[model samples]
Target: MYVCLCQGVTDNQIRDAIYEGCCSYREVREATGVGTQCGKCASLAKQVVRETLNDL
Candidate 1:
């Protein structure tokens, strides 16, 4: 499913970025370019990063 409708980004993309080395929101921001389009997906994308860290 599309996580960021505006950017057409996905949860998988964010997770993949996290697995790579994106440990921060800014990192995620730079990796998948999710939060740049609109501010709505920023929080959820951050949550995904946080949860990914917690999972590992």
Candidate 2:
């Protein structure tokens, strides 16, 4: 499912940023525009990134 509605971001893109060397929330945000929109999905984005990091 899509993670950030304001930007049409997806969980897979988040994971891609992680594997692409994005190691922090800011990096991921900049790479995926995850929390760059309305900010509603910021928390969930963080959670996905956290979980994805653990899974990797």
Candidate 3:
């Protein structure tokens, strides 16, 4: 789904970022521009990152 609406980023993009070594939400932002726009999707994006980490 469209996880990072601002950058037209997706949940798959987030997951790929995570697998590719995005260690934090800031990293995700840097990699995908997820939270860089309005900042609303940031928290949830961070949560998904955390969950993906936990799964690892």
Candidate 4:
């Protein structure tokens, strides 16, 4: 699903970022620009990062 609509980022993109060595929200933000725009997606973006990292 769309996690960061402002940047057209998806949950899968976040997951891929995690797989690409983004161990933290900041790294994911830099990697995919998930929460770079409006901050509404920050929470969900962080959640996706947590969940994806846990799966790894």
Candidate 5:
């Protein structure tokens, strides 16, 4: 599903970023531009980060 519609980002992109060493939402935002527009995806982005981290 789309995580950041403004940046055309998806959950998979976020997960890939996380797997690529993005340990937090801020890092993921910088890497994938998630939640950089309206900030609506902040919570979900953080959630994905945490969940992906658990998988690591």
Candidate 6:
């Protein structure tokens, strides 16, 4: 799904970013610019990122 509308990032892209060492919301933002827009996707991003990191 389209997780970052602003940067056109997808869930898989975010997961890849997480696996690439993105450990926090801030890092994800820097890496994918997912939450830089309205911030609604931020919470979901956090959830997914946390789960991704936890799986690591």
Tens digit of per-residue lDDT, candidate 4, span 1-56: 99988999999999988998988999999988898998899998998899889999
- Runs of candidate 2 with Cα error greater than 4 angstroms are none
Please give the ranking of all candidate structures by lDDT, highest first, separated by commas: 4, 5, 2, 6, 3, 1
Tens digit of per-residue lDDT, candidate 6, span 1-56: 99868778899998999888888878988988988888778888888888888899
- Residue pairs in candidate 1 whose N, alpha carbon or C atoms collide under 3 angstroms: none
Per-model TM against the reference = 0.85, 0.88, 0.86, 0.91, 0.90, 0.86
Where does candidate 3 stray beyond 4 Å? Answer: none
lDDT of 3 by residue, 1-56 (tens): 98878789888889999999878777878888887889888878888888997776
Clashing pairs in 3: none
Candidate 5 clashes between residue pairs 3 or more apart in a chain or in different chains: none
lDDT of 2 at 1: 86
What TM-score should be assigned to candidate 4? 0.91
lDDT per residue as tens, model 1, 1-56: 67898888899888888888877878888877897977788888888888997886
Candidate models: Cα lDDT each: 0.83, 0.88, 0.85, 0.90, 0.90, 0.85
Per-candidate alpha-carbon RMSD to the true structure: 1.1, 1.0, 1.0, 0.8, 0.9, 1.1
In candidate 5 the C-alpha lDDT for residue 50 amounts to: 91
Which residue runs does candidate 1 get wrong by more than 4 Å?
none
Q: Under the 3 Å rule for N, CA and C atoms, how many clashes does model 1 have?
A: 0
